[PDB]
């Protein structure tokens, strides 16, 4: 654990939190638990709340991993961001095998309702729909879109709101890092349209999985995302190939500069445990020691 907490410091700057992705496998090993307890104030389940883990077989839910994280979070006063309710990846074959509109709709609604109800009132925000956009801005042709149609998004959000009116509902996606990129402009326009039709989209989550030097563009991208009018926006899965302090500080400043940005979540704790470990993209090294990027963030927030 680092002496200076980025969560404490960002809270002092007026934001809600600075957190990290984690799960039982991390909390039970190394110094992950201690680091999170001391330097972060929010956690997102890296995998335990996804569809393949929670509903491997239809109507047969498994909350072992999810319960571990939620309980640990509550016991340690950490906020929680539910991830991911509707997504084409890490999706059971029984779901993708469905071709009937009514069937898939009910299946999707039940999945959403079951997970959110179990943790009702305990989750600050949920990534209801994940990666629904193609790079050109068109909607990704997933089983949900192909079988239910474009209305699957409004349906997912309306269902989520009814399940837990306390949680902030997000649509999450990547490559929303540049203001001139098609995808960024498209999600803004679509979210503007959906909210206008009454869809309860409370926030846009920008994964922010960057490569070296892409932090600079976020300074203009985040404000653009905020222009969609959602009450909230957030950096949800931050990591940067190379872990340059320049990229990290730029992303933090982008959030500080955007009134509606509630916080930042970095996608993991130590480099070797990153899903992109070959790019040592996190804030702590294999020795669980703070990297130059962590200190740079601290210095920027003070
Ligand atoms: O442990 C990794 C996770 O980190 C990874 O997370 C996904 C990555 O793709 C998207 O960003 C999605 O929103 C995240 O949940 O998923 C694979 C798993 O092995």
From Swiss-Prot:
Under SUPFAM superfamilies, the record lists: (Trans)glycosidases (SSF51445)
Which cysteines bridge via disulfide bonds? 255-261
Identify residues that carry Pyrrolidone carboxylic acid. Answer: 1
Molecular function as annotated in GO: endo-1,4-beta-xylanase activity
- Check the record and name the Gene3D superfamilies matching this protein: Glycosidases
Keyword annotations for this protein? Answer: Carbohydrate metabolism, Disulfide bond, Glycosidase, Hydrolase, Polysaccharide degradation, Pyrrolidone carboxylic acid, Signal, Xylan degradation
Q: Which Pfam families match?
A: Glyco_hydro_10
Concerning its family, UniProt says: Belongs to the glycosyl hydrolase 10 (cellulase F) family.
Q: What is this protein called?
A: Endo-1,4-beta-xylanase
């Amino acid at each position: 654990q680092a002496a200076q907490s980025v969560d404490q410091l960002i809270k002092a700057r007026g934001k809600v939190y600075f957190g990290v992705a984690t799960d039982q496998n991390r909390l039970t090993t190394g110094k992950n638990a201690a680091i999170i307890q001391a330097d972060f104030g929010q956690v997102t389940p890296e995998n335990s709340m996804k569809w393949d883990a929670t509903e491997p077989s239809q109507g047969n839910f498994n909350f072992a991993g999810a319960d571990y994280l939620v309980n640990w979070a509550q016991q340690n006063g950490k906020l929680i961001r539910g991830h991911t309710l509707v997504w084409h990846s890490q999706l059971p074959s029984w779901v993708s095998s469905i071709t009937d509109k009514n069937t898939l709709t009910n299946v999707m609604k039940n999945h959403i309702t079951t997970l959110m109800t179990r943790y009702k009132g305990k989750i600050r925000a949920w990534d209801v729909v994940n990666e629904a956009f193609n790079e050109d801005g068109s909607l990704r042709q997933t089983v949900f879109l192909n079988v239910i149609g474009e209305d699957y998004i409004p349906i997912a959000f309306q269902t989520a709101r009814a399940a837990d009116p306390n949680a902030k509902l997000y649509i999450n996606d990547y490559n929303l890092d540049s203001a001139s990129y098609p995808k960024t402009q498209a999600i803004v326009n679509r979210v503007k349209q959906w909210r206008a039709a009454g869809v309860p989209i409370d926030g846009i989550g920008s994964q922010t999985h960057l490569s070296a030097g892409q932090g600079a563009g976020v300074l203009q991208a985040l404000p653009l995302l905020a222009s969609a009018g959602t009450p909230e926006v957030a950096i949800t899965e931050l990591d940067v190939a190379g872990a340059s302090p320049t990229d990290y500080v730029n992303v933090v400043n982008a959030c500080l500069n955007v009134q509606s940005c509630v916080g930042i979540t970095v996608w993991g704790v130590a480099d070797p445990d990153s899903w992109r470990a070959s790019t040592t993209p996190l804030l702590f090294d294999g020795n669980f020691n703070p990297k130059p990027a962590y200190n740079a963030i601290v210095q920027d927030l003070q």
